[PDB]
Amino acid sequence: SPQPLEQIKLSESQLSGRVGMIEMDLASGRTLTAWRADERFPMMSTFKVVLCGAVLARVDAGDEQLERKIHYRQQDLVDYSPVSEKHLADGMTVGELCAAAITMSDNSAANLLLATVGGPAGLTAFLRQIGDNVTRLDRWETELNEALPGDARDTTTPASMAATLRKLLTSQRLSARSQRQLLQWMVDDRVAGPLIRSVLPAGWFIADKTGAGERGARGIVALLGPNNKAERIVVIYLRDTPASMAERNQQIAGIGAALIEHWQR
Ligand SMILES: OC[C@H]1O[C@H](O[C@H]2[C@H](O)[C@@H](O)[C@H](OCCCCCCC3CCCCC3)O[C@@H]2CO)[C@H](O)[C@@H](O)[C@@H]1O
Numbered sequence: 001s002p003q004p005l006e007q008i009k010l011s012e013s014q015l016s017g018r019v020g021m022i023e024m025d026l027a028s029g030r031t032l033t034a035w036r037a038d039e040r041f042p043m044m045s046t047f048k049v050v051l052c053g054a055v056l057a058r059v060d061a062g063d064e065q066l067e068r069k070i071h072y073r074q075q076d077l078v079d080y081s082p083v084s085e086k087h088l089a090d091g092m093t094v095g096e097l098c099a100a101a102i103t104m105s106d107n108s109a110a111n112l113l114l115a116t117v118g119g120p121a122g123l124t125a126f127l128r129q130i131g132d133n134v135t136r137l138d139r140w141e142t143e144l145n146e147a148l149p150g151d152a153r154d155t156t157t158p159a160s161m162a163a164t165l166r167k168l169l170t171s172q173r174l175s176a177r178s179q180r181q182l183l184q185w186m187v188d189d190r191v192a193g194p195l196i197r198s199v200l201p202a203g204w205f206i207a208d209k210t211g212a213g214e215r216g217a218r219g220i221v222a223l224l225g226p227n228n229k230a231e232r233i234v235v236i237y238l239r240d241t242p243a244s245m246a247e248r249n250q251q252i253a254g255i256g257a258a259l260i261e262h263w264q265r
């Protein structure tokens with residue numbers, strides 16, 4: 001494979017789309033590779049990690065419990081809700097809702113949790129509280145995936161998302177137990193985690209949350225590293241490409257391959 005930046009450029013050319021990417025040391029926050037890192041991209045379902053960061057902050061403060069059971073109704077549901085559809089009779093705990101939102105990308109689970117943090121406006125306020133002055137959530141699932149060309153709604157930048165993820169996972173803004181919980185939810189991703197492991201060389205750690213939207217929008221936020229360690233945050237977003245889902249997946253994988261072959265920097 002090419003060097004990381006060369007592969008990122010190739011991916012843009014082949015996709016006829018914009019790619020945004022950051023590679024950041026998790027421990028120190030050092031930025032290693034950056035491409036369009038200050039440009040806006042739809043978050044899509046990658047927002048679900050930040051959402052559950054906000055939930056955990058409420059838990060730490062004693063304003064929420066992961067055990068608390070929410071008994072929601074069918075009228076609360078939106079599409080792509082494989083876990084929450086199973087529990088109209090019996091409900092789900094707040095912790096189960098975060099697990100479903102992150103590991104299964106469950107949209108109704110996400111919307112239920114979003115309401116508990118004050119909706120899109122409340123999550124945006126939480127982001128400002130942790131010093132992210134760029135990321136914004138404006139809509140609910142599933143409209144937040146619309147990815148209209150030039151629309152700033154529901155966007156982040158690779159740089160802001162990476163910094164925000166590092167803050168949530170490591171800065172001690174969250175309790176130790178909450179930091180550990182957020183990480184484990186990403187480790188447990190069922191949408192892409194197992195597939196990614198199936199193509200990673202032996203020894204490479206992965207934890208992740210993916211997202212998909214309209215007009216080619218697709219993304220991943222991840223922890224990756226050799227020696228079975230979460231060494232780096234890697235954030236990749238695609239937008240405004242007519243390419244197939246299969247190619248979008250392959251292009252993101254190709255950027256990963258370039259990172260893997262050229263890790264020491
Ligand atoms: O010499 C380096 C490695 O080269 C190949 O590994 C290949 C692997 O066979 C392939 O499946 C993967 O595809 C890339 C898969 C990437 C997975 C998704 C990446 C995510 C992770 C973080 C967020 C962005 C994307 O590339 C590597 C590097 O060429 C060999 O198979 C392996 O034995 C060897 O250790």
Ligand SMILES: *[B]([O])([O])[C][N]C(=O)[C]([C]C1=[C][C]=C([O])[C]=[C]1)[N]C(=O)N1[C][C]N([C][C])C(=O)C1=O
Nearest residue numbers: 044045079080142143145146210211212213214
């Ligand atoms: B997450 O925010 O990435 C979850 N993403 C979704 O639920 C997407 C999945 C999807 C992507 C692309 C296409 O063409 C369909 C579904 N949902 C989504 O983008 N759309 C947008 C809004 N639309 C309303 C008519 C949906 O129902 C929908 O699910």
